[PDB]
Design an enzyme around this catalytic site. Structure first.
Site, PDB file in Angstrom:
ATOM      1  N   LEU A  16      77.480  28.441  25.530  1.00 43.83           N
ATOM      2  CA  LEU A  16      77.015  28.373  24.139  1.00 43.83           C
ATOM      3  C   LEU A  16      75.453  28.082  24.137  1.00 43.83           C
ATOM      4  O   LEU A  16      74.838  27.526  25.047  1.00 43.83           O
ATOM      5  CB  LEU A  16      77.724  27.261  23.297  1.00 43.83           C
ATOM      6  CG  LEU A  16      79.260  27.615  22.758  1.00 43.83           C
ATOM      7  CD1 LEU A  16      79.552  28.971  22.382  1.00 43.83           C
ATOM      8  CD2 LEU A  16      80.252  27.099  23.753  1.00 43.83           C
ATOM      9  N   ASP A  17      74.967  28.190  23.021  1.00 45.86           N
ATOM     10  CA  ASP A  17      73.416  27.767  22.594  1.00 45.86           C
ATOM     11  C   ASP A  17      73.624  26.766  21.404  1.00 45.86           C
ATOM     12  O   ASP A  17      74.720  26.199  20.964  1.00 45.86           O
ATOM     13  CB  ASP A  17      72.695  28.924  22.031  1.00 45.86           C
ATOM     14  CG  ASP A  17      71.570  28.498  21.027  1.00 45.86           C
ATOM     15  OD1 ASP A  17      70.984  27.516  21.290  1.00 45.86           O
ATOM     16  OD2 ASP A  17      71.235  29.276  20.214  1.00 45.86           O
TER      17      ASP A  17
END
Ligand code: U10
Ligand code: PC1
Ligand code: EHZ
Ligand code: SF4
Ligand code: SF4
Ligand code: SF4
Lengths: 115, 176, 115, 85, 155
Positions: D39-40
């Site tokens: 994820l970011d």
């Protein structure tokens, strides 16, 4: 006989007026035409949320006022009595009391708007 | 100097109080208004019926443009582009060319009657009185394209209202 | 020189912070506008548009700059939840009527002289 | 009926499944969102979004930034909800 | 012949419309103030049948008079959509005929027609209160010349 004939005739004529009004003119509905009017722009969205008006107190008092206007309506027939001395005293009682109820209603704010 | 406008304290004499009491009880300034309108009811209406009679103007009125031409018949516009250079709305668009006779006329003189704002600078601009707004305030069209005038329409307006432009300019050529 | 006056944020980190509650507010904001504004897109179709702006705005590194558009985003969010914008204003984010523009060089070459 | 740590166990993990990008194979107790799950920080934001409305609390960005592993949520909402059994 | 009765009913319907069209209360800018002079006692628009009713639900012709800009263009088209059928829009003044003086600015739509199907174009900056007085009457001639039922009886 005559009264409901008069009543029936009037509602009939009205019904035809709206009937030809609502049917004849070659409708064309395209949704935004049926959209609510909000002075040129879109509605914020409600119009059924509770519109809190500020004359609530003056509202109910009007109901009480009408309840006693019905009381003082038989005066035209009450004047044709054999005891005007009693009828005059009791009649003036209602107006004195009605003024008194308003006077309290007036003096203790009341009539004034809620802000 | 300055003048105070409204602080006039009313008198409290019995005559004055009863006058105000009569005014409030027996509505008078309201009746003063009614008598006013009734007086202003039996006047002569200021209306004029349309085209059968028309409103009054002045010789220097500004309206539909026209490109006039000399008494000989030759057009006045020598295409100096002054009107284009002064046009506040940049409605003037002209291109010139050395004509066959050698004279200096314009190939195109599209005036966009949907841009310019009738400043009248153009009639002040050209030193040959070439472009000038006519007295014709009436040229409303049904389509947008009709308003975009070219050179040909301008000359046609010049040939149609030439009687007015010669007379109106004759009247006002001394004031300017 | 290098010393400059910062707007609100004092380095990247809280500048990175401020973009979060903008995303925190925007994400919570999507489903009610789709209902209130009567939008044509889905609730899912709004989060991406909210999302895709954010790393479209990703090359920015200056802390002052970052805080400058977080105010613009907050103002845009501000002018959205009071229905101050309209259906057209919101829909302008979805480039709908504008036909897709080519990307490859050959298509650029076919259409017209432009880079 | 008070809830337990296992009652959270499924329910934090459950609300994480609903996110489309997260891969069903890559979930774990210690799985890294940025590295393992991939994820970011933007993607870190809405897995928080799914998580307070599901349980029914409110977690600010003061603490929402370092809860990244799934159990880092569990040991956190345990103390927020005082679930210590 | 059915053509005769159709034409007679044709003339009856439009004559009602052209002698009772109600211009909306829709003013924008400099072009609106002199349009009041049309409604002023000098020209007395009302004498020609029109009344200046607000509420686009109860209006026929929309006098777009003034500069049409970006921030209001949604408001106008919402207003135009609210107007019942038939509805006419007279683009009044050079600003609403293409942009007017500010044709080249950044927050003006160059022409009222780009938002609304615009009927007869009356030019002027501003058009004289009489200049579009003809503009209204010239629309009354357009209403006179329609066919409607004539097309329907021949559809
Ligand atoms: C912002 O911008 C603005 C402008 O510009 C853009 C303007 O210009 C102006 C200036 C223009 C003005 C006129 C100034 C006043 C205008 C305003 C908007 C200011 C606010 C107005 C008011 C406070 C007053 C409003 C008053 C009104 C509307 C007048 C109402 C009364 C009237 C008598 C007029 C209307 C009459 C009508 C409609 C005719 C009758 C109605 C009918 C339905 C017709 C009859 C129908 C039948 C009989 C039914 C059919 C039956 C039949 C035939 C019977 C036989 C058949 C059977 C089957 C029985 C303003 C102010 C402005 O602010
Ligand atoms: C009291 C009034 C007495 C006279 C009433 C005459 C009828 C008027 C109806 C409204 C206008 C429509 C009409 O005349 O015919 C309908 C007809 C219906 O058929 P039409 O095909 O012409 O309708 C218009 C076109 N479409 C369908 C695309 C909307 O319409 C017209 O005449 C309008 C053209
Ligand atoms: C329907 C319409 C609804 C409404 C539709 C959307 C309406 C507009 C919304 C706001 C758009 C606005 O232009 C941008 C803003 O508010 S803020 C930009 C944040 N810029 C930074 O923070 C620095 C650069 N970027 C990074 O640092 C990281 O790459 C990133 C933050 C992307 C991920 O973080 P990760 O830790 O890498
Ligand atoms: S009248 Fe004025 S604005 Fe119009 S074309 Fe001439 S110079 Fe330009
Ligand atoms: S119309 Fe007048 S200003 Fe324009 S090019 Fe001709 S002479 Fe010059
Ligand atoms: S056309 Fe001229 S008078 Fe009318 S609004 Fe525009 S600038 Fe004003």
């Amino acid at each position: 006989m005559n009264i409901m004939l008069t009543l029936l005739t009037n509602v009939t004529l009205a019904s035809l007026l709206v009937l030809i009004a609502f049917w004849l003119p070659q409708l064309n509905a395209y949704s935004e035409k049926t959209s609510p009017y909000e002075c040129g722009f879109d509605p914020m969205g409600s119009a059924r949320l509770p519109f809190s008006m500020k004359f609530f107190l003056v509202a109910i008092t009007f109901l009480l006022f009408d309840l006693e206007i019905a009381l003082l309506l038989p005066l035209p027939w009450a004047s044709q009595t054999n005891n005007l001395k009693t009828m005059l005293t009791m009649a003036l009682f209602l107006l004195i009391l009605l003024a008194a109820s308003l006077a309290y209603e007036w003096t203790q704010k009341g009539l004034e708007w809620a802000e | 100097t300055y003048k105070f406008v409204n602080m006039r304290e009313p008198s409290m004499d019995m005559k004055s109080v009863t006058d105000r009491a009569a005014q409030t009880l027996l509505w008078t300034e309201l009746v003063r208004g009614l008598g006013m309108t009734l007086s202003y009811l039996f006047r002569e209406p200021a209306t004029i019926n349309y085209p059968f009679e028309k409103g009054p103007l002045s010789p220097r009125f500004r309206g539909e443009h026209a490109l006039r031409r000399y008494p000989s018949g030759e057009e006045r516009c020598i295409a100096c582009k002054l009107c284009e250079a002064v046009c506040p709305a940049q409605a003037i668009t002209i291109e010139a060319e050395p004509r066959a006779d050698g004279s200096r006329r314009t190939t195109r003189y599209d005036i966009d009657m949907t841009k310019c704002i009738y400043c009248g600078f153009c009639q002040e601009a050209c030193p040959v009185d070439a472009i000038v707004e006519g007295p014709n305030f009436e040229f409303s069209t049904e389509t947008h394209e009709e308003l975009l005038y070219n050179k040909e329409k301008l000359l046609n307006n010049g040939d149609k209202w030439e009687a007015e432009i010669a007379a109106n300019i004759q009247a006002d050529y001394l004031y300017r | 020189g290098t010393s400059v006056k910062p707007i609100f944020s004092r380095d990247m980190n809280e500048a990175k912070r401020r973009v979060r509650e903008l995303y925190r507010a925007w994400y919570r904001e999507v489903p009610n506008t789709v209902h209130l504004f009567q939008l044509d897109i889905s609730v899912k179709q709004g989060r991406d548009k909210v999302r895709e702006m954010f790393m479209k705005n990703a090359h920015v590194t200056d802390p002052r700059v970052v805080d400058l558009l977080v105010i613009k985003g907050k103002m845009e969010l501000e002018e959205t939840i009071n229905v101050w914008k309209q259906r057209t204003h919101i829909m302008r984010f979805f480039h709908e009527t504008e036909a897709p523009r080519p990307t490859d060089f050959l298509s650029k070459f076919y259409v017209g002289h432009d880079p | 009926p008070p809830l337990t740590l296992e009652a959270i166990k499924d329910r934090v993990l459950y609300v994480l499944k609903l996110y489309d990008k997260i891969d069903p194979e890559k979930l774990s107790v210690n799985s890294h969102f940025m590295k393992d799950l991939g994820l970011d920080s933007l993607d870190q934001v809405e897995i928080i979004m799914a998580m307070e409305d599901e349980f029914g609390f409110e977690i600010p960005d003061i603490d929402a930034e370092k809860l990244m592993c799934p159990q880092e949520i569990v040991d956190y909402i345990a103390d927020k909800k005082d679930v210590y059994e | 012949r059915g053509e005769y009765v159709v034409a007679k009913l044709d003339d009856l319907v439009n004559w009602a419309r052209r002698s009772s069209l109600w211009p909306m209360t829709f003013g924008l800018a400099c072009c609106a103030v002199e349009m009041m002079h049309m409604a002023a006692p000098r020209y007395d628009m009302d004498r020609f049948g029109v009344v200046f009713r607000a509420s686009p639900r109860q209006s026929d012709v929309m006098i777009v008079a003034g500069t049409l800009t970006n921030k209001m263009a949604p408001a106008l088209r919402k207003v135009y959509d609210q107007m019942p059928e038939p509805r006419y829009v007279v683009s009044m003044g050079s600003c609403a005929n293409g942009g007017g003086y500010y044709h080249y600015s950044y927050s003006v739509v160059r022409g009222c027609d780009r938002i609304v199907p615009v009927d007869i174009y009356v030019p002027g900056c501003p058009p004289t209160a009489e200049a579009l007085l003809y503009g209204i009457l010239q629309l009354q001639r357009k209403i006179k010349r329609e066919k409607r039922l004539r097309i329907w009886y021949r559809r």
